[model samples]
Target: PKVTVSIKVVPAVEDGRLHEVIDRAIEKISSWGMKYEVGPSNTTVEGEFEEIMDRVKELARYLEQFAKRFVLQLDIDYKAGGITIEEKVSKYR
Candidate 1:
């Protein structure tokens, strides 16, 4: 539970609908218009810590419409006080 989350979802597909679901998934996250980054495997977003959890819940439920079962790989980061994406990014580059 933190301000940043990286989500990777593998939704069940019957007719190889993953491509459709994935492209749409990006758009869905993009719809938020928040600071988000998409990578080869997952999408990382930074925003309200409390509000983000609900969005995760929303995604879980949203996938239910198409998937029989799915897997969500969630990576959430936090510190003793607080941290930010840039805070660590600056460390290397």
Candidate 2:
């Protein structure tokens, strides 16, 4: 079983409009038509690697538009004793 964890953190600005910023970010995520859960100041989207990456790139770009400072951290794990899967057959046997 292989899995990846991605977390993005954007500073919470105190402009009396932080909620709006959060909501706007969530809105854009929703517009992508992804299956996600929106939190007070964060969002979690789950899907295949490419799917998640594409969406995350989009959201990250959006956040950069006005984000005071942010960081996108991606953690990837191939949980099968580190057997190389790339360039090989990809499927759940």
Candidate 3:
């Protein structure tokens, strides 16, 4: 199955910043040979459903190590045989 997930990370503490956390998240995604788009408000990644789920689990754990309090907003789309990021947007490109 193919999957798409959008994640928005917000730091709860006044001294915490999302920049570093987001960077690390992207780094981890890259390490796993994933594909993603960094948008103004959130980051979206796509891959096999199981891989994406596993990555998100690991990411949540890594994020907790940074801040005791934080907000994570996640949106996921899945299809057994799905369209890809490029196939979805390439027509306009």
Candidate 4:
């Protein structure tokens, strides 16, 4: 169940209103225990698929508390043995 997930969250609101919702996602991701890297446009997280989705669902719930409507795009990339962000980027780095 090892995989890499890229998630983009957009709260349909002004720039000021967007900050808290996006920041909360990162904070929750950090405390949720996934090895992660936050990107400018989105965030990449690597971990067990089951747990990742579970955490994402919780995040969606949290978003509901404030976001009347939002956009979240999730992409999953999986391999037989798994992949890591470092492993994918280290060569160029």
Candidate 5:
């Protein structure tokens, strides 16, 4: 099965002291094989749904260490097509 997902992550605040947080976030997720674009304080990633969720959880855990006020929102747009058409039979079939 294949799924598509879009994720948005926001960091609460940047005091110039925790710039490493941003760098760490970018590096960590990039290593996960996701294609992402970064904003000043947000990142949008699109890829396989399961992989994206796993990555989001991992990143959220890491971000919590830097800021308690950070937020992570996940949106899924998916279609599962692995099943054979024969498996879905109707009277019309």
Candidate 6:
């Protein structure tokens, strides 16, 4: 099940810079060989739908261990062939 996910991970506490936590989370996704693009607010990732969700969940869990609270905003496109972040917005480039 190929899918495209736009995820915004927010850490409630000001424990550290938001990018720091978000970077670590993105690292996990990259290590898994998923395609991703980092934007100003959200990150777009494409891969197997189930695995992508697992990564998102793991990110939430990891952030929760340290942050007082956490929020995950996800926009999922469960298309049969999956869509790439580039395909979605390359025209603007």
Predicted structure with the largest lDDT when compared to the true one:
4
Q: Model 6 — which ten-residue stretch has the worst lDDT?
A: 61-70
lDDT per residue (tens digit) for residues 1-93 in model 3 = 567787888866564566787777667766767688887888878788777778778888887877677777888876668747776667988
- lDDT, candidate 6, 1-93, per-residue tens: 467898887877575577777776667667768778877988788788888777776777777655657687999987666666667778999
What is the Cα-based lDDT of residue 54 in candidate 3?
Answer: 80
Candidate 1 lDDT, 1-93, residue by residue in tens: 237778888877865788667676677777765688888999888777777777778877776776768788888886656667777576878
- Model 6 Cα shift for residue 49 (angstroms): 0.8
Candidate 5, 5-52: lDDT as tens digits: 444555677767356666777777777775565656455555666677
- Could you estimate the TM-score for every candidate? 0.78, 0.55, 0.80, 0.90, 0.56, 0.78
Candidate models: Cα lDDT each: 0.75, 0.56, 0.75, 0.86, 0.62, 0.75
TM-score of 1: 0.78
Q: Assess the local accuracy of residue 83 in candidate 1 as a C-alpha lDDT between 0 and 100.
A: 61
In model 2, which runs have C-alpha deviations exceeding 4 angstroms? 1-8, 72-93
For lDDT, candidate 1 versus 5, the one ahead is 1
lDDT tens digits by residue: candidate 2, 1-93? 323433445545776865566666767767866455554545655445666677777877788766766555554443453323331324643
TM-score of 2: 0.55
| Candidate 3 regions with alpha-carbon error over 4 angstroms | none
Off by over 4 Å in 1: 90-93
- Model 1: per-residue Cα lDDT at residue 92: 77
Clashing pairs in 2: none
Ranking by TM-score: 4, 3, 1, 6, 5, 2
- Residue-level lDDT for 17 in candidate 3: 67
